Amino acid sequence: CGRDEKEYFSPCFAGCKATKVSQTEKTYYNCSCIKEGLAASDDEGQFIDA
């Protein structure tokens, strides 16, 4: 899922060139092939990600 509520398949196809994985969730970073999306988004140790 992207922050535009639009559902993107193949999380790596989302252009995410980086992925930091936490203890209780999986998240993807530097998501290039995403469209503008990303209205408010969020995160802490890092900024913005899908």
Binding site: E36, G37, L38, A39, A40, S41, D42, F47, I48
Partner: protein, 94 residues
């Protein structure tokens, strides 16, 4: 060389990026809004119940000289109506 800055903001101390979003029905149609850190500079995240008062500071060329006590008016640029001020006219006095 004298300006004002709202307390607790840094022009480029923090880094993030460019964004785009759409806001509808809270305006004064669907107009796209682009946020860039270059001009707006920093984004402050306020919780569900938090209120904020942007106390402003007067800066001379080399440093801040005093806290502005004058009346100031606040309004978001794009044009909305959802924001409101908690105090009323009577509580302030009129």
């Amino acid at each position: 060389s004298k300006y004002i800055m709202v307390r607790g903001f840094n022009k480029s101390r923090c880094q993030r990026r460019d964004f785009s979003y759409v806001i509808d029905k809270e305006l004064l149609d669907n107009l796209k809004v682009r946020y860039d850190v270059a001009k707006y500079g920093c984004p402050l995240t306020l919780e569900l119940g938090q209120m904020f008062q942007p106390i402003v500071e007067l800066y001379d060329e080399n440093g801040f000289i005093k806290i502005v006590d004058a009346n100031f008016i606040l309004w978001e640029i794009h044009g909305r109506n959802d924001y409101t001020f908690n105090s009323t006219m009577e509580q302030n006095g009129c």
